Design a protein around this ligand. Structure first.
Ligand SMILES: OC[C@H]1O[C@@H](S[C@@H]2O[C@H](CO)[C@H](O)[C@H](O)[C@@H]2O)[C@@H](O)[C@@H](O)[C@H]1O
Ligand code: CL
Length: 138
């Protein structure tokens, strides 16, 4: 029962073969969830399930540099369900973050921020009960 928003330090940043696992349950009538992999004030990878954008469910991914959001990448596969437990796994690979939800591949997001070893925090926020957040080298 972690408190959201939750900050998970990523010591020495991320690197290929690092697997980040987030376990929680979506609140009833959820509106949003966000993962923010941060390089200081920059957001290297924002992963943002939206449960009601014009009565559609969509995941928005983006990067924030010098306080400016870039060009969004959108995924209409939407594996989250209000009220239900989920597992998000983010595997860092050489060219992208690779995301699986509930053991099914979801999307990849190419690295825009190049200094992976400076992406040293993960913020987890939004309409969830957060059970755990951790990493391991695989
Ligand atoms: O791009 C991800 C980013 O989206 C914004 S909402 C976004 O704001 C821009 C201007 O900054 C446009 O107005 C666009 O139509 C849309 O409203 C926000 O949700 C942020 O947390 C992040 O998800
Ligand atoms: Cl960079």
């Amino acid at each position: 029962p972690l408190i959201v928003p939750y900050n998970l330090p990523l010591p020495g940043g991320v690197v290929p073969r690092m697997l980040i696992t987030i376990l929680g349950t979506v609140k009833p009538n959820a509106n949003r969830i966000a993962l923010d992999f941060q390089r200081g004030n920059d957001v290297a990878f924002h992963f943002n399930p939206r449960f009601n954008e014009n009565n559609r469910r969509v995941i928005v991914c983006n990067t924030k540099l010098d306080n400016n959001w870039g060009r969004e990448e959108r995924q209409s596969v939407f594996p989250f369900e209000s009220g239900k437990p989920f597992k998000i796994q983010v595997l860092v690979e050489p060219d992208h973050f690779k995301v699986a939800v509930n053991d099914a591949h979801l999307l990849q997001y190419n690295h825009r921020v190049k200094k992976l070893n400076e992406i040293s925090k993960l913020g987890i926020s939004g309409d969830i009960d957060l059970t755990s957040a951790s990493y391991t080298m695989i």
